[PDB]
């Protein structure tokens, strides 16, 4: 049915960090050939409610974007993992230890005794570049929510929703064969 | 074996092993095919690819 | 009319094949009927 369609549940490819095509939700569907119109109305209302919930979930969670599935994602769109502050303590004072050794002292380490100072280093071990690329599972399930395609495949061929096909690259739009 | 008992053909995909072919023993697919040919094609002309 | 949903899902008394299918699919079938002929794969009801 075009009015109330089955949502297009996406498929995740956890090597490239991107969706690999989409297909209709043929797994979570309820049979109604044993039901008369009284329950047919209920089932249709349930499907419509599910479609509405999917649409509003898309509006809430999915980030706006021109392409349906950008294979390579911008750095800012990708949710980077937070990193804590690393505190490290310098154990030994090299210049004072060198002075003591030059004046004829042997130090067998394990605050020492001869060093009154005590310095600490605090820094953030951020990656040099903010890891532009694929999408993790959490962000994928957050953003690539099931799609409700109301009027299916109506119009010119270039107006169809591509990337529903599992084997389809956006660059040089075509289907990759063997 | 068409519309037989134990001898039932299957077109099931590898997904769920769910057969896409059901026979009822109340349906005559042989006669249906004969009528279909007699109504679509000029059956008075002999063909050798099938008998 | 206690069987209309069934007779519409299985196209016994529902809508014509030209207008329950995708319009793009209808265009494809009418474009490639000369050699590939999708037209005979879909049933359209005939209701008295």
């Amino acid at each position: 049915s075009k009015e109330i369609p089955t949502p297009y549940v996406w498929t995740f490819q956890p090597q490239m960090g991107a969706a690999a095509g989409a297909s209709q939700d043929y797994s979570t569907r309820m049979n109604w050939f044993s039901a008369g119109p009284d329950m047919i109305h209920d089932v249709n209302n349930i499907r419509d409610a599910q479609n509405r919930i999917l649409m509003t979930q898309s509006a809430i969670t999915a980030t706006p974007r021109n392409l349906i599935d950008p294979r390579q994602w911008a750095a800012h769109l990708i949710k980077q993992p937070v990193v804590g502050t690393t505190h490290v303590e310098m154990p030994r004072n090299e210049v004072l230890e060198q002075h003591l050794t030059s004046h004829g002292a042997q130090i067998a380490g394990g605050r020492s005794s001869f060093n009154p100072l005590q310095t600490d280093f605090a820094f953030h071990a951020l990656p040099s570049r903010p890891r532009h690329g694929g999408i993790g599972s959490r962000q994928f399930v957050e953003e690539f929510v099931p799609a409700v395609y109301l009027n299916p495949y109506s119009g010119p061929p270039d107006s169809y929703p591509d990337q529903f096909i599992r084997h389809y690259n956006v660059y040089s739009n075509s289907v990759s064969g063997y | 074996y068409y519309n037989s008992g134990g001898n039932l053909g299957v077109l099931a995909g590898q997904s769920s092993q769910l057969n896409a072919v059901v026979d009822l023993q109340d349906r005559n697919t042989e006669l249906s095919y004969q009528m279909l040919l007699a109504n679509t094609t000029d059956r008075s002309r002999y063909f050798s690819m099938w008998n | 009319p206690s069987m209309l949903p069934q007779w519409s899902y299985m196209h016994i008394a529902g809508q014509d094949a030209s207008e329950y299918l995708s319009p793009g699919l209808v265009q494809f079938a009418q474009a490639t009927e000369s050699y590939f002929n999708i037209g005979n794969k879909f049933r359209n009801p005939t209701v008295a």
């Binding site: - | - | 030209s18 009927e33 879909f42």
Partner: peptide, 30 residues
């Protein structure tokens, strides 16, 4: 595209078929 690239071109206009040509009904018991 227009799907006219998939049909033979009798000159310029494509040799498109009827819009309602799709679909069939052939069923009688006798």
């Amino acid at each position: 595209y227009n799907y006219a690239a998939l049909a033979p071109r009798q000159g310029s206009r494509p040799m498109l078929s009827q819009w309602s040509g799709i679909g069939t009904h052939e069923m009688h018991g006798g």
